[PDB]
Paper text:
The genetic studies presented here clearly demonstrate that pyridoxal kinase activity is essential for growth and survival of Trypanosoma brucei in vitro and in vivo. The resulting structure revealed that TbPdxK has a typical ribokinase central core of β-sheets surrounded by α-helices.
Two loops (120–129, and 266–274) are missing from the model due to their flexibility and resulting lack of electron density, and several amino acids had to be truncated to alanine residues in the model as a result of side-chain flexibility (Lys99, Lys130, Glu131, Arg188, Arg223, Glu265 and Ser275). Compared with the human and sheep ATP-bound form, the adenine ring is rotated through 90° resulting in different protein contacts. The TbPdxK adenine amine interacts with His220 carbonyl while in the human and sheep enzymes the interactions are with Val226, Ala228, and Phe230 backbone atoms (the latter via a water molecule). In the two different ATP binding modes of TbPdxK, the γ-phosphates make different interactions. In one conformation, the γ-phosphate interacts with Asp117 and Glu152, as seen in human and E. coli PdxK. The conserved GTGD ribokinase motif is present in the TbPdxK amino acid sequence (residues 226–229), and is seen in this structure to bind the γ-phosphate as in sheep PdxK, rather than the α-phosphate as seen for human and E. coli.
Numbering used by the authors:
A (entry chain A), B (entry chain A): 1 to 120, 130 to 188, 192 to 264, 275 to 299
The structure:
Amino acid sequence: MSEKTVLSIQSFVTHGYVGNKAATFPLQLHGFDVDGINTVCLSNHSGYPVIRGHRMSLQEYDELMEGVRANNFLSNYRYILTGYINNVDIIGRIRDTLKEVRELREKEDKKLTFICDPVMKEVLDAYRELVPLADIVTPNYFEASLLSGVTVNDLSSAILAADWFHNCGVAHVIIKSFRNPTHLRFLYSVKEGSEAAVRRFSGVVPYHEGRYTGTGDVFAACLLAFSHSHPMDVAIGKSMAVLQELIIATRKSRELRVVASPQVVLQPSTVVDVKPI
Amino acid sequence: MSEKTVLSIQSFVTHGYVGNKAATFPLQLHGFDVDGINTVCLSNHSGYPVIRGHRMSLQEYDELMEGVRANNFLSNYRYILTGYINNVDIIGRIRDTLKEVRELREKEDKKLTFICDPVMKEVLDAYRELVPLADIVTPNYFEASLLSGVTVNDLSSAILAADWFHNCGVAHVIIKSFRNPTHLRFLYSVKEGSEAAVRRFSGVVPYHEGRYTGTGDVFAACLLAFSHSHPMDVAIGKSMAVLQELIIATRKSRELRVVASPQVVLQPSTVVDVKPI
Ligand SMILES: Nc1ncnc2c1ncn2[C@@H]1O[C@H](COP(=O)(O)OP(=O)(O)OP(=O)(O)O)[C@@H](O)[C@H]1O
Ligand SMILES: Nc1ncnc2c1ncn2[C@@H]1O[C@H](COP(=O)(O)OP(=O)(O)OP(=O)(O)O)[C@@H](O)[C@H]1O
């Protein structure tokens, strides 16, 4: 408990649990004031026969942001969370949105934590430019492979990928999974500065067959929430646990029912060991 | 606990607690799957020096709805909740959105409850056409005065206003307040059909000086939630209590901090007597 304000910039769907709908409830459950910017407002996520809706233009984004800036809302965000954007100009514009906030915050001696979930064209080049400004990044193995140039097959390659992120400026790197078969392994790598020694942690979670929509979005939201007063390694463990229990709860590519299981999001009971290397 | 699906059609702001942001969290806290349609996506509510953002056009609404309809999402809403729309064509279109859902539901022998918060031009005429389809309406005194043609000054006039709503087809009418000075009085009036006797209830809540944004939006959301398994009179009492406690909690035109007080939304402790007349 402290300043729990988040600007969350992600997709929005009317039906299903992805993007800002998936992120906002877990955050609010943990006491966070979430200011949302919906980069798209669609009918649903991919998977269905049909998808429709509105996609935010650069003009619309800029215009929204005029109000947000003019009314001094930028000074009051302790966190920025980005998810699915898929627009070169806007992900390109977020570099600016981030930079306006950080300077506003630093001038009043308050902190800012930018958590970038690099959800993935020319969008890749734009992410390569944005990720260096992140305090925490949460790539899946595919996104880590694309950004770093290193195919993330296993722990060793995951570590080389994570080094790329530290080299471009990122302190905290979570590579959320890679697949001995009946488990998924993750890597957390932390390097608190150029002249700072890197420490790595790894752990596993049981693999469950099938696909589950919105897992990455809920993970990032829980990571933010748990990172507020838990050390990062503990926060990663609790986030992995939330997902592990939610994926099991829906076993009784389909939705996670987070709303049906709020105590799981608040207080996961499954223990995930995030073990130092 | 039962089918807790809601299609909620209201405004959305990035900053502040109004519209769909104000409604969605209380509903989710009570276990509801909320499918949101954001009729506008603005930077903030009225009150600030500047307001900016996007307003949904008829074309956009229709296009969104194509996806929602095509994917058979309409059949799975137990509730429809409407709030701030302010667009003749769209509030005009909601008549259709409502009618598609009701027939889909009736054909599978399931129920539908439409709660209309008639937030208020040519918009008035359009509401006069939409309100007859509502199961529950939640006008403030101004909106009851505008719709009915009767100035709602006191209990007697509130009752004549409520009669207008029953006459055009509405079973459950809540006139949320009118101002002996240190209290606000409300009226709940129920008439379960043309050939059904009207019953009325009234109660009071302590008046608190100042303005508080989003009270109507949170009230309607809590009413829906509490109406699910409580009788309506009890549900009105609990909703009035939630607001009464939230307005007191922010005393320690400014925001209600619902996220800071989730147990108040789930389990209000203040008792509001909804007394039969
Ligand atoms: N069967 C599963 N599918 C997806 N995620 C799982 C599964 N089982 C466990 N998880 C947990 O969910 C977390 C997020 O999964 P992943 O790394 O695939 O993100 P993602 O691919 O972005 O997910 P999504 O695309 O669904 O948002 C993983 O770190 C993992 O611990
Ligand atoms: N000082 C107050 N201001 C507003 N609402 C209050 C106040 N004190 C108690 N309330 C409760 O809040 C409920 C909603 O208020 P009201 O009927 O004014 O809706 P509204 O005018 O639509 O509010 P808003 O415009 O803020 O959404 C009332 O029924 C009342 O019981």
